[PDB]
Amino acid sequence: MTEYKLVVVGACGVGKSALTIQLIQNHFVDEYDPTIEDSYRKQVVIDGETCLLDILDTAGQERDQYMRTGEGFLCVFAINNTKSFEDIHHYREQIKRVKDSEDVPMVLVGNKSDLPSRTVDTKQAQDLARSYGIPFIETSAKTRQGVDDAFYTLVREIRKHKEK
Numbered sequence: 001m002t003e004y005k006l007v008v009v010g011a012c013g014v015g016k017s018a019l020t021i022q023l024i025q026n027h028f029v030d031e032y033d034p035t036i037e038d039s040y041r042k043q044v045v046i047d048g049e050t051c052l053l054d055i056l057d058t059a060g061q062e063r064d065q066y067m068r069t070g071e072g073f074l075c076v077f078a079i080n081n082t083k084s085f086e087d088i089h090h091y092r093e094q095i096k097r098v099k100d101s102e103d104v105p106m107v108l109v110g111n112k113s114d115l116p117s118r119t120v121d122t123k124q125a126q127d128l129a130r131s132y133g134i135p136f137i138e139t140s141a142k143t144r145q146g147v148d149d150a151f152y153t154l155v156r157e158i159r160k161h162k163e164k
């Protein structure tokens with residue numbers, strides 16, 4: 001059984017917890033306590049390989065130890081929160097710093113696609129991920145659009161970087 005350490009990052013309110021809950025439990029949550037940071041588990045056979053996903057859902061204060069052993073990063077913004085999207089450059093800079101690498105397994109996630117009248121357009125997200133050399137996945141923790149893609153793609157990005 002192969003372990004993968006995943007770290008979900010992004011601003012308050014983007015849907016980090018909701019996306020994780022959708023992965024573990026296959027249902028959309030309305031609230032979830034913004035003060036809870038923990039690491040959760042999910043066992044899935046991905047491409048014939050029994051995986052144990054260790055998904056750290058971040059929260060708390062505005063630490064290198066935890067982040068340094070992250071193998072892949074889910075960088076999440078909400079498509080109706082321009083600031084959360086603009087924040088992604090900061091999170092990427094800081095992740096690179098701690099891995100001392102230009103090539104860190106990373107997936108850019110645009111969450112809340114079920115919400116009307118987005119303020120961050122898919123072109124803006126697609127351009128950013130292209131510039132980073134990383135996949136972009138649009139999600140809705142509400143429908144569940146893209147939730148599997150986001151996590152399975154990150155696992156695959158990790159494999160691409162290193163033997164597992």
Ligand SMILES: C=Cc1cc2c(N3CCC4(CC3)CN(C(=O)CC)C4)nc(OC3CCN(C)CC3)nc2c(OCC)c1-c1c(C)ccc2[nH]ncc12
Nearest residue numbers: 010011012034058059060061062063064067090091094095
């Ligand atoms: C994940 C660690 C982290 C979080 C924040 C952060 N969080 C706020 C958002 C939540 C967690 C963390 C998610 N939460 C919730 O869901 C509850 C509502 C709270 N915010 C800001 O900075 C902000 C944003 C960009 N602005 C331009 C300036 C100020 N930086 C952060 C930061 O980099 C620190 C430089 C790091 C960080 C990284 C990536 C890498 C190594 C590191 N080691 N130690 C910190 C750190």
Ligand SMILES: Nc1nc2c(ncn2[C@@H]2O[C@H](COP(=O)(O)OP(=O)(O)O)[C@@H](O)[C@H]2O)c(=O)[nH]1
Nearest residue numbers: 012013014015016017018029030112140141142
């Ligand atoms: N319509 C909609 N609401 C969402 C979605 N994802 C999260 N939310 C809501 O956004 C709010 C904050 O989400 P939460 O998962 O706590 O965000 P966090 O701070 O990143 O963990 C909650 O009320 C969620 O129900 C989504 O994909 N669509």
Ligand SMILES: [Mg+2]
Nearest residue numbers: 016017034059
């Ligand atoms: Mg949360």
